[PDB]
Ligand binder design. Sequence first.
Ligand SMILES: NC(=O)c1ccc[n+]([C@@H]2O[C@H](COP(=O)([O-])OP(=O)(O)OC[C@H]3O[C@@H](n4cnc5c(N)ncnc54)[C@H](OP(=O)(O)O)[C@@H]3O)[C@@H](O)[C@H]2O)c1
Ligand SMILES: Nc1nc(=O)c2nc(CNc3ccc(C(=O)N[C@@H](CCC(=O)O)C(=O)O)cc3)cnc2[nH]1
Ligand SMILES: [Mn+2]
Ligand SMILES: [Mn+2]
Ligand SMILES: [Mn+2]
Length: 159
Amino acid sequence: MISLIAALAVDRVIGMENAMPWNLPADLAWFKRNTLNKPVIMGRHTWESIGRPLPGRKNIILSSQPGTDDRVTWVKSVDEAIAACGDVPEIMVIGGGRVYEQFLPKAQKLYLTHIDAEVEGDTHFPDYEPDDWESVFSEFHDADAQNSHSYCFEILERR
Ligand SMILES: NC(=O)c1ccc[n+]([C@@H]2O[C@H](COP(=O)([O-])OP(=O)(O)OC[C@H]3O[C@@H](n4cnc5c(N)ncnc54)[C@H](OP(=O)(O)O)[C@@H]3O)[C@@H](O)[C@H]2O)c1
Ligand SMILES: Nc1nc(=O)c2nc(CNc3ccc(C(=O)N[C@@H](CCC(=O)O)C(=O)O)cc3)cnc2[nH]1
Ligand SMILES: [Mn+2]
Ligand SMILES: [Mn+2]
Ligand SMILES: [Mn+2]
């Protein structure tokens, strides 16, 4: 099974200048809980944005060019990325925009955080078709001393 996980600001913005400008510790904790002990697939730009391997996960990087770091696994196509995960119950695709576009048609589940924040961005999560997806979990949180925007964790499953 393939799943996508992402955090979206208003208008589906996910990034600006190869960074995420906000800081929501509760959402990063959610990301860790839902990805630990699973393989994670990311594009090369997202690898550069994170800047180090994510511990406790098999890190798989898509790039058309040879890899430059043997602490992670480098692959050259979507089918190779999936194969490099092996026989696991759930593969997590962690972006960025170009990678989400390619894996969305193959995904059964979306883990989305909706952040109440207006961000000028240059990268968006794909337009997906709402009729294709059932919401099976949602949990709203107001802003607090650690998280400066309200946010909503949602899990969607392909109908
Ligand atoms: N809010 C969130 O949830 C979230 C999550 C992830 C990322 N982001 C943000 O998203 C942005 C990065 O997204 P992006 O769309 O620019 O880049 P991306 O999807 O991370 O990386 C694209 C790169 O991946 C490689 N690639 C993608 N598909 C491939 C394929 N089928 N075969 C081979 N290589 C392939 C290419 O590398 P080469 O050029 O080396 O061939 C391509 O240039 C940043 O702002 C980041 O902060 C946000
Ligand atoms: N829900 C969600 N939120 C995000 O912010 C997110 N970000 C990315 C891409 N960017 C990043 C940037 C940093 C870390 C990161 O350092 N995660 C740590 C959390 C511990 C911490 O530094 O607070 C990790 O071990 O997973 C992960 C993804 C991909 N999917 C996401 N999915
Ligand atoms: Mn092929
Ligand atoms: Mn197999
Ligand atoms: Mn806000």
